[PDB]
């Protein structure tokens with residue numbers, strides 16, 4: 001039962017961003033000398049082998065719209081998750097210089113939807129859709145990241161009222177821990193569309209415990225301000241309190257906002273340029 005040491009298997013390089021449940025680093029697989037991303041989760045207070053088994057299952061996923069998993073390695077109380085590295089920045093990173101235009105939003109949402117359609121067709125739930133987990137390559141390709149595990153890391157805490165993580169993107173049925181399915185991602189997608197349009201999810205000025213309380217009780221958010229009627233309607237379609245009333249990802253790919261505004265992903269290199277200029 002002697003475990004491989006991830007610090008020997010991988011060279012941890014610079015931090016590249018805050019992930020859910022842990023910081024994310026660029027890394028090198030020392031066996032292949034290939035670049036990877038590494039997220040280290042501290043599981044001192046927690047079923048570890050169930051999470052590793054599911055990461056192994058998810059490492060078999062294969063889609064242009066979803067980052068690869070490359071397994072995970074436990075070291076004492078820390079779980080090293082190994083992932084495909086993308087270097088363009090997350091959509092959250094790329095929101096820093098200023099507002100996105102509706103073509104950028106529609107392009108990014110279209111790619112997210114294709115990734116959600118893939119995961120849902122494989123009977124998986126992303127469960128952590130937010131701009132921070134939407135990644136760009138240096139060429140503008142868009143892939144979902146950190147999918148398929150957040151439920152194992154949070155659902156029990158939510159049941160016990162011991163969850164202290166961030167609630168802004170959670171569907172009401174996830175907060176109430178009733179039966180939830182892929183439609184939970186569709187709610188989170190609607191919140192993420194607001195985040196891409198306005199820079200932050202609804203209720204971002206409120207205490208997270210008030211937000212956890214509000215989401216299942218309040219009318220769902222809507223997109224307010226100078227935004228096109230199709231974009232507002234796309235948001236409204238996602239943000240229905242009843243999950244059976246939300247459309248599937250496959251249906252949303254046909255939404256007129258997506259079809260009339262999405263353009264080539266290669267144009268999103270302009271967004272990466274803006275980040276460079278912002279930080280130059």
Ligand SMILES: O=C1NCCCCCNc2nc(c3ccccc3n2)Nc2cc1[nH]n2
Pocket residue numbers: 016017018019020024037039067083084085086087088089090093132133135145146
């Ligand atoms: O699979 C990942 N999950 C981790 C998802 C949460 C972190 C997202 N923030 C991020 N992420 C990058 C990155 C690279 C270069 C510059 C900025 C970057 N900002 N790269 C990355 C992330 C992952 N892979 N590659």
